[PDB]
DNA sequence: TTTTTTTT
């Protein structure tokens, strides 16, 4: 009596499993009677307890199979195929819509019955970020627009200033909010090439700490990143398809994603300055350090650097119409939950404390 | 019963699907009821809704097979094999009739019953393009007819210029018309020594931001590309078929295609100048800016860099003589529409709006 | 009759074996008569003598199989798939309890009656360690927390002190305790690429004896590791994911582990100094050397380097509540076993002997 | 009722096809009815229409095969094995026989129906070259059979005479006639080894101007290269095998190819001239360059540079009995196919004009 | 009937044949009748003639098989599998005990009836080596024990002396006796990575002729090696695990083997001298030289190079009780053989002859 | 067979 490969593939679709080993490992767990399944009884992993009962019968047969890896290979290929179909057909708006659904699914789990996330801690993060710069949530919408529109030769925002001024914290939150990857340009010119190959089929990329020259003027270590980025003008323009690469692999050719670049305050040629649509300078604020010192759950749980903290900020501050028709359904049930559990007085007390440099919770 | 690999390959042929994962995914969609199919109901994707009903039955049999990737591989290979036999045996003129049939089949969709964009906008593009430089449209025909009739030096162009001067947009439009690839050769000798190999069965090639070591009198970003391209004489000359590099796949030796160099305003040795049909020496013009600033619909839709933007100009300016007889059936019939949809006052008014720096539309 | 692949997969899981040849070679041993198996009779290897009697029947048929390596490969994949599942789903604290349970299992054999250690010698090692620094056991707890919490920019401790002052000894013990890798960054920048690849999915890392520059007056040889560390800030900070690499294998994206830097008495740029959480100064002290030269079994058995000794220190010193919940049952039993076998007076006698520089035992 | 693997191999042998995708692509076309096959109707391509009618029956069965690429791989293997077996046996005349045919095949297209080569201006170059130096058809015939005989010590030619005396041009033209490559010597000795490796299995090789010391006062670039050359007594005299080397690969040994050294009016130690069959001195003579200045089409169409111009000279001067014994038939076809076009008188007309310095044609 | 894969695997185990091709070739020789087989008849190779008659029947079927290399692969895998088990499980004493059995098996053949060696001449080897240093036999026993215990710090021995003073001769015999590798550390610092890579999994290592600074003060050449050893302290002390690399392979980690260092009499940095357990001085001695002139058979048969000679010395000189217990039975038989073959009278005259510098034998 | 090594 044979294995249903169809049931296996369906699990890999429903749980969007990218890895043969991950798929293999988790399907094996279903061989034990879900009846007795300690993990299900303790509700610890949705990708398991949502499925164990349905897949149990098939898993017992799969446990005996001699073909196992081949069964998994066909499954993962199907998920990969689905991604390429999507990537070659979705609008960037629809792509962003899908990412928001993924994050909302995580939020529903985080604050769910399992409930491990304290939404009080998470909302403190929103206050801190809204405090960091003026008009914060409006600036986020402007970033989201230009990432969606992907307007050629107006594609990159420059984050600049002194150290410990939060630029990477915001960048990491933005990069979790979208999809994307960090990349490092501060490399010898031969090394860059498999490296920039990583950007294949990503939605954002972030370049870090790109080293200027003559920086000792500023007590900055001079280095390559800026002079390398000069040679990348074609990629930054996004004005025509570039070629990308991997080991043992042929190239793929595509427009290069949009993104963000971070800078200690080196000088830059204006020939390059022309190629950024916008620039933001970050500057230190004594009271924020005090606040974090009092409130280290903000750091220890990484809340301030999470895309989930940005998403909550947007849900709080933006109109419902700023979200696509499909997700407005879920935006509705989230806006109410925040309000139902943070009266404006609560958030005011928080945002007050942040500005005061007081420990946020009291 | 059992999968018809024949029907698979017929889909792959008729959709020209070169990609095994793309093909795998696309064909798997057909497993569901076409009579239900929401994509067919939307008429969302041509390469779906044309075919779903026909392949539905075969896809259900495919949906349970265990050979799935192997089935796709054979089918895809006939696509490549056809493409390569065709590449070898067809005249470059016949190739253009093929390429032009392709673009017409897209235009057939773009202004199909969906009216998915308004042709007024694309024609505002034609005005914004043709107005750029003397006799603009004619240059397209001259360039194209060089790309068929290959001759030494009479194979390559310099698009020299300053910042913000259209050369890239021109080039991008030309490539999206013709089919081909772009390249960077500011990148070093070894990278160049592989990347020259991109030319397999391509009709045309273009080069990007190519910087020469001089030009600090114009403070240019400066580099090796001048020396490299100068040194890349066989590829330039095309006087014999040359090796084209590949990784883990069959390399080949072919006539190196014709193409264009874009470069900034470097100093150039007169011998290095003595290599072309012609230089085109790009310059800025003021009205363009103000037009676009109003006409911002152009760029989210990427009209002015599209290939089909050119073809509308070409249709606009050229006599019916300027086309092959097989396409003349389509071309003439299609050329009718422009009068139905534009009195010439429209085009006049648009180009005047362009000239006056207004939003092109009124 | 036929081979049970399932029993092989069980054995691989039960022994947690990863190497296909180790698994193969092991399984083959069961083919001989269990009732005459000299290894079983001699009770030498538990991974043999627990299992031969059970597996014997299937091992005879395996010994005849024409397919032996494919059977083993599927079994190894099952074990590796478990590691993958764990790496994604477990918390850092859970990983640490798994490691502790494995070490506790290793301890239970060594100090079993069928074991081979002397618990008095292994306890003697603890006395030497608790003299090596002030409040040694508290420092271990504070370090363990630091690695479990993994707080960005607060992730690395610096060990410095003259040569022959125990820093490498202590790192090797913590490294065995947690699992991890040592790394050497006194390299040219190219090879350093693959060297940092070794960190992949490790819990800790230890950078070994990085070399500063200048200080021939310090009488330290100069090198370049510290200039390299100053580049690698991003890897220390753990703020954002980064891409690791292996020979002939694709780039792997993860956040980089927390860890330790060890260093002789070089000067350190304030930048790197600001980037370490804590600095521990080791010093050479005579009575340790004199005691150690009288207590050489401490060296001979590697007692002083080995993580088992640190775990024993925590069991002795720390409250039971400081251990994760489920292991408290086992930890309580070990505390009782230690108390059964050592008075406080024995431990006090040992520490006083160490202070006197006499041999620890008396 | 089954695919004959045999017939597929035959077609691969007759096409001498070395590519599995091409062979796949080609053979699939035979599946349609040969009876109406429009390529068979149009008769554009004999490599199709010769075969379709025979293969059609088998091609239908092939088009239904699920194994197609495997059939085709075996077919290409056969042709590669065939070429390898043959390649191990060649006389140098069989080499020259094979390498001749390429030019004829190309001419059969260049001046064929595609006809993009003007045979007149091509023959104008042939006439032009005739007066560069004495009796050049015999000079080349004497040179060339020496390259077949390859008799030790009797294998190398030296060009002398001042800048702009034509030696670079004629050398490169002969290199085109022959294949092979040229090499430098003007390097510190270690560099030479991999460059010498280029000679591996070349039919012929060349050496560029030797930067001869004993050129200083002559104001020629001057230094080691002549003394470097003097150290390679062995290779040139070509009695015995020698080692050769390449980047990233192990050594090989061969009898080094025969060849040419090309030089200006330097010094020469007798030690080196002792190694030569023939000195030739080159004179700049004004009617040559001034005719070219009056005939510069030769430069653009690369005519005099071309190896086909050299073979054309031989074809038109030399007696049929001198060419490769069987191919003489084909040579007579080409002679006839040219004789009808050009008399001695028109060729002599050209010769008069060049000798007078007048532009070649009238 | 069919190939028994088991009988092949049994041959591979008993010949300990590690290489698939060697296993393949060996087994095919059994095709022919052992009854006539000249290799059997002449007793040329025990790995043949001990086995031909048993394996003959299976070899006949093997020679018709179509799977031949597959059978060899699984057979060889069994051999490798046995090593991997043994490497991780055995004690250093058992490893040496196994190594002794192998050498004794050779001696059983070598001094057998077919045995081509003279036990008399090989006993001259023992006489010469027992002359080379005071208490030679005791030195060997202490060295071996030191390797077996592998006590950290106390791991390494230093040989010093003039050229042609014997240090390499003794290193070579020790290295054969134990198994191990010779390494060169006079390299530049970069290449050292792969050189140390050779130490992977060895039992001993020998470092060859490490050159010091400034030994030109007594005509010695000079180089890096001593400075490099002043780097690698932990490799010598052997307290801590270290990473090791091979070309194209990911690093592995282990304790670095114990071993020997050899040098001419440079000065030694006392940092390095503190590493070594013991220094042995080699000094040239005329009577050894003069005796060696008249005992050429020692050199010509490489007697004094070989581990076999040392094992004979240990058998003669050490008590039976002094070996690991499983070997002691064989020792008694070899003791009995040797005491029959020589009176103390004869042996002591030979030592006297070496002191005479006369030929050993009379 | 590339990529790693080797080349540099
Ligand atoms: N505006 C600010 N004023 C004061 N402290 C700040 C500010 N922004 C961030 N911080 C502190 O700086 C720490 C580091 O933040 P972050 O990494 O985002 O800074 P950065 O300037 O982007 O640094 P880098 O260039 O090193 O990546 C934060 O954890 C926070 O404690
Ligand atoms: N002729 C022009 N005059 C003024 N601005 C222009 C002109 N052509 C292009 N630009 C500006 O440059 C933008 C990018 O166009 P494009 O890439 O074609 O120009 P380019 O000269 O090739 O650019 P680059 O200097 O980056 O190579 C346009 O959207 C427009 O804003
Ligand atoms: N505090 C100490 N006082 C005296 N001797 C010490 C002390 N710590 C270590 N030792 C001695 O130093 C030896 C080497 O220890 P270890 O390798 O850990 O030292 P280290 O200073 O960290 O060395 P390195 O800097 O070379 O890594 C120990 O085996 C012991 O003999
Ligand atoms: N026989 C000739 N008579 C007159 N001019 C000549 C002759 N041959 C070559 N030229 C001139 O010499 C120029 C360079 O030709 P070529 O490189 O073949 O000569 P060369 O003697 O090898 O030169 P050089 O030693 O300077 O590199 C030609 O462009 C032409 O102007
Ligand atoms: N102690 C000795 N007295 C005299 N001659 C010796 C002595 N040892 C070796 N020889 C002679 O020197 C030759 C080389 O011996 P060996 O290679 O062991 O010397 P070495 O000093 O270790 O050399 P190297 O330092 O070059 O490795 C021997 O074959 C023998 O002829």
UniProtKB/Swiss-Prot annotation, chains A, B, C, D, E:
EC numbers on record: 5.6.2.4
Regulation: DNA helicase activity is inhibited by ATP-gamma-S.
Keywords, in A-Z order: Acetylation, Activator, ATP-binding, DNA replication, DNA-binding, Early protein, G1/S host cell cycle checkpoint dysregulation by virus, Glycoprotein, Helicase, Host nucleus, Host-virus interaction, Hydrolase, Inhibition of host innate immune response by virus, Inhibition of host interferon signaling pathway by virus, Inhibition of host JAK1 by virus, Interferon antiviral system evasion, Isomerase, Magnesium, Metal-binding, Modulation of host cell cycle by virus, Modulation of host E3 ubiquitin ligases by virus, Modulation of host ubiquitin pathway by virus, Nucleotide-binding, Oncogene, Phosphoprotein, Transcription, Transcription regulation, Viral immunoevasion, Zinc, Zinc-finger
Binding site for Zn(2+): 37, 40, 48, 52
Location in the cell: Host nucleus
Span list, region ATPase activity: 153-351
Domain SF3 helicase: residue ranges: 135-295
Residue ranges of the region described as Binding to host TP53 protein: 72-362
GO-annotated biological processes: bidirectional double-stranded viral DNA replication; DNA replication; symbiont-mediated perturbation of host cell cycle G1/S transition checkpoint; symbiont-mediated perturbation of host ubiquitin-like protein modification; symbiont-mediated suppression of host innate immune response; symbiont-mediated suppression of host JAK-STAT cascade via inhibition of JAK1 activity; symbiont-mediated suppression of host type I interferon-mediated signaling pathway; viral DNA genome replication
Keyword Acyltransferase: no
PTM description: Phosphorylated on both serine and threonine residues. Small t antigen inhibits the dephosphorylation by the AC form of PP2A.
Other known facts: The sequence shown is that of strain 776.
Quaternary structure (record): Isoform large T antigen forms homohexamers in the presence of ATP. Interacts with host HDAC1. Interacts (via LXCXE domain) with host RB1; the interaction induces the aberrant dissociation of RB1-E2F1 complex thereby disrupting RB1's activity. Interacts (via LXCXE domain) with host pRB-related proteins RBL1 and RBL2. Interacts (via C-terminus) with host TOP1 and POLA1 allowing DNA replication. Interacts with host TP53, inhibiting TP53 binding to DNA. Interacts with host preinitiation complex components TBP, TFIIA and TFIID to regulate transcription initiation.
Function summary: Isoform large T antigen is a key early protein essential for both driving viral replication and inducing cellular transformation. Plays a role in viral genome replication by driving entry of quiescent cells into the cell cycle and by autoregulating the synthesis of viral early mRNA. Displays highly oncogenic activities by corrupting the host cellular checkpoint mechanisms that guard cell division and the transcription, replication, and repair of DNA. Participates in the modulation of cellular gene expression preceeding viral DNA replication.
Protein name: Large T antigen
Full protein: residues contained: 266 to 627 of 708
């Amino acid at each position: 009596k044979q294995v249903s490969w169809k049931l296996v593939t369906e699990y890999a679709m429903e749980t969007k499993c990218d890895d043969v080993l991950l798929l293999l490992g988790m399907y094996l767990e279903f061989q034990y009677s879900f009846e007795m399944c300690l993990k299900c009884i303790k509700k610890e992993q949705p990708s398991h307890y949502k499925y164990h009962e349905k897949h149990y019968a098939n898993a017992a047969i799969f446990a005996d199979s001699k073909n196992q890896k081949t069964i998994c290979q066909q499954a993962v290929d199907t998920v990969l195929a689905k991604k390429r179909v999507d990537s070659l057909q979705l609008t960037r708006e629809q792509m962003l819509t899908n990412r928001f659904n993924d994050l909302l699914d995580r939020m529903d789990i985080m604050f769910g019955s399992t409930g491990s996330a304290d939404i009080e801690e998470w909302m403190a993060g929103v206050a801190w970020l809204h405090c960091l710069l003026p008009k914060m949530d409006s600036v986020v919408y402007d970033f989201l627009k230009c990432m969606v529109y992907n307007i050629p030769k107006k594609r990159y925002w420059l984050f600049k200033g002194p150290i410990d001024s939060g630029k990477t914290t915001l960048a990491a939150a933005l990069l979790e909010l979208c999809g994307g990857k960090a990349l490092n340009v501060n490399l010898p010119l031969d090394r860059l090439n498999f490296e920039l190959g990583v950007a294949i089929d990503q939605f954002l990329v972030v370049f870090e700490d790109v080293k200027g020259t003559g920086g000792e003027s500023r007590d900055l270590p001079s280095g390559q990143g800026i002079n390398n980025l000069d040679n990348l003008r074609d990629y930054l323009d996004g004005s025509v398809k570039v070629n990308l690469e991997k080991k043992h692999l042929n190239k793929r050719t595509q427009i290069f994603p949009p993104g963000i670049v971070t800078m200690n305050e080196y000088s830059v040629p204006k020939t390059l300055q022309a190629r950024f649509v916008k620039q933001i300078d970050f500057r230190p604020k004594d009271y924020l350090k005090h606040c974090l010192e009092r409130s280290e759950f903000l750091l220890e749980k990484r809340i301030i650097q999470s895309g989930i903290a940005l998403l909550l900020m947007l849900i709080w501050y933006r109109p419902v119409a700023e979200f696509a028709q499909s997700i407005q359904s879920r935006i509705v049930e989230w806006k109410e939950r925040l309000d139902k559990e943070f009266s404006l007085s609560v958030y005011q007390k928080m945002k007050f404390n942040v500005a005061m440099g007081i420990g946020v919770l009291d």
